[PDB]
Structure 1
Amino acid sequence: TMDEKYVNSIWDLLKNAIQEIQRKNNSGLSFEELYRNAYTMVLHKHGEKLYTGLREVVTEHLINKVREDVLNSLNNNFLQTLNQAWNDHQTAMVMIRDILMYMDRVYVQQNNVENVYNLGLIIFRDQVVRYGCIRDHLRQTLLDMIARERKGEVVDRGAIRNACQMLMILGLEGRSVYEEDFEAPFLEMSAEFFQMESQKFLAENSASVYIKKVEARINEEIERVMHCLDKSTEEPIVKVVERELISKHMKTIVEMENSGLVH
């Protein structure tokens, strides 16, 4: 019953069955059929091949459909393709998880390997974001919109919000993916922007006007980061503000210009 061939009908070689409904041809996969015989998932060891095949089919359906459809857009509508790909993968993965929760409950965590859903997220992260061209697409795109919004031109935020939210959630528990992808270049361009902005406000405004304008603009950029980016990015830009607008104006501030400080 557990051993020797019974080929040609049901059970085993599910890559096709999985990728049928990953193409959203849904009537149910086989869940009612596998409900009854489930005291043989771990006691007769069909779980090794099933876990390996699941990882393999997820990877293959990422490369075959997800990635090349992500790549066809450079930076325009690339946001829409990424969002649709993530939605489709999550839709597939959530109904995937229900099939194999018993072996994931015992054997997977017995083997010190990541959770099946977390495994699907890891594989999506490896196959889409961590590959070079897509990663640079994301970095350049988030950088361009954040810089353009900082420059004074209005841009759409929902797309950058969902992309960044992917970057957090694809980062597993932490923001490791987001930190590796966009957080550091964002901090760099933010430091540059704060420096040039403080210098231009010093040049174009008098002492009190410089103070008022720079405080209002610090408030404005904090508001934008809460509005155009997520919450966890406020502390890095706060320390960048401290190091670029105050720590680089410690000793150039004693006398200012026009209306000065002693004045």
Structure 2
Amino acid sequence: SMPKLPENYTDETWQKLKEAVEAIQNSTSIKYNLEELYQAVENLCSYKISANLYKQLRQICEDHIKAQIHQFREDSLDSVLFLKKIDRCWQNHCRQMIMIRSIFLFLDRTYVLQNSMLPSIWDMGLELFRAHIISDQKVQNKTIDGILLLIERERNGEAIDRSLLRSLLSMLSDLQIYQDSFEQRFLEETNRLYAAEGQKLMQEREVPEYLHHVNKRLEEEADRLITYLDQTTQKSLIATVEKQLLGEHLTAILQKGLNNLLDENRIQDLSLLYQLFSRVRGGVQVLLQQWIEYIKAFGSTIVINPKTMRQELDDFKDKVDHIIDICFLKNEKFINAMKEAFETF
């Protein structure tokens, strides 16, 4: 049993706001001065029910957003051009919703809706954009497929628009669907790519070149993470790269290349090896075991194929002490390993 709103005729006040919002939506002129609109909002929450004005605004927002779906059926459109079109649609939505939020600030801030479980105006916009644009199965699949394809291209050496990618993945975070839509597939595809890369390059390249490559990839993925992914992806991503390029090959690497690195006294590469293996569960342990093996095999070759035995031992001890000192950072475990291994001969 409500009161009559002060206005010249029924619905005058709401109409002004309807027209203002449509102007915002079509990017034309707002043909009222702003004070009048702020007042309109204040009157409509004072004499009528706030929850109703919110429903009215939600509806005209929904009508417009629903209408923006159609531009995304124009396939088979170029993948990048599609992603740009989604981004432009996202920017226009955000711009419009921020402006609407300014006009209706009183509604957002109202004491009566303190306790309401109705989303804020901004969040209401996000629900609508999620529900009607990005949740559509065809649009989502094409958007996510395009994002993943850009990352794949970059990992293969191509130049892409990282800025476009940042903007899209950031949209996915604002819509709270980054984890669901994008992240699991991204980690799946990263797992598949680096599993295959690990196995392929471990045949094609010698250990020193492989380790240099693994280091580059870890630095690259850090840079991807900093530049356009969400921080919540960091542990998973690095763990995946570490696992596929190092974890799966720890023993193979050592078997193929450790003897050569140690025989040939390759200090820089030995340092790198130790840094990389330090990143993975079991790494230093597996290294330490093969180190014991190398050291034991050398003593057997001294006693069997000796010009002087003491001198040959001293030379080896010096070389190996030095490697422990610089490449393995003075790690006591390697010193002990070595002393135990020496007692074998």
Give the aligned partner of residue 272 of structure 2.
none
Give the aligned partner of residue 298 of structure 2.
none
Gap regions ≥5 residues in structure 2: 262-289, 295-345
- Alignment match of 2:121 (pick from 99, 102, 116): 116
Contact 2:41 2:107 in 1 (8 A): no
Give the aligned partner of residue 23 of structure 1.
26
CA pair 8-150 structure 1, distance change in 2 beyond 3 A? same
Q: How does 1:107-256 map to 2 (within 5 A)?
A: 107-171=112-176, 177-256=177-256
What does the per-residue CA deviation read over 1:144-192, in whole Å, with 9 as the maximum and x for residues that have no partner? 1111111222222221121112112222xxxxx1111111111111111
Contact 1:225 1:234 in 2 (8 A): yes
TM-score normalised over the length of structure 2: 0.66
RMSD: 2.8
Q: Distance in 1 between matches of 2:126 and 2:162?
A: 24
Q: Distance in 2 between matches of 1:156 and 1:35?
A: 41
- Alignment match of 2:107 (pick from 103, 108, 123): 103
For the residue of structure 1 that corresponds to 2:80, the secondary structure is: coil
Q: Distance in 2 between matches of 1:192 and 1:87?
A: 33
Please tell me whether Structure 1 or Structure 2 has the larger radius of gyration of its CA atoms.
Answer: 2
Q: Distance in 1 between matches of 2:212 and 2:38?
A: 68
Higher helix share: 2
Counterpart residue identity of residue 130, structure 2: R
Q: Distance in 1 between matches of 2:94 and 2:232?
A: 24
Gap regions ≥5 residues in structure 1: 172-176
For the residue of structure 2 that corresponds to 1:161, the secondary structure is: helix
CA pair 201-56 structure 1, distance change in 2 beyond 3 A? same
Counterpart residue identity of residue 102, structure 2: D
Counterpart residue identity of residue 143, structure 2: L
Q: Give 1:17 deviation, angstroms.
A: 4.1
Give the aligned partner of residue 70 of structure 2.
68
Q: Give 1:47 deviation, angstroms.
A: 1.7
Identity of aligned residues (%): 27
What does the per-residue CA deviation read over 1:99-151, in whole Å, with 9 as the maximum and x for residues that have no partner? 22223222333221211112112211222111211110111001111111112
Q: Give 1:206 deviation, angstroms.
A: 1.6
Deviates more, 1:10-19 or 1:127-136: 10-19
Contact 1:206 1:259 in 2 (8 A): no
Contact 2:14 2:40 in 1 (8 A): no
Deviates more, 1:197-206 or 1:208-217: 208-217
TM-score normalised over the length of structure 1: 0.84
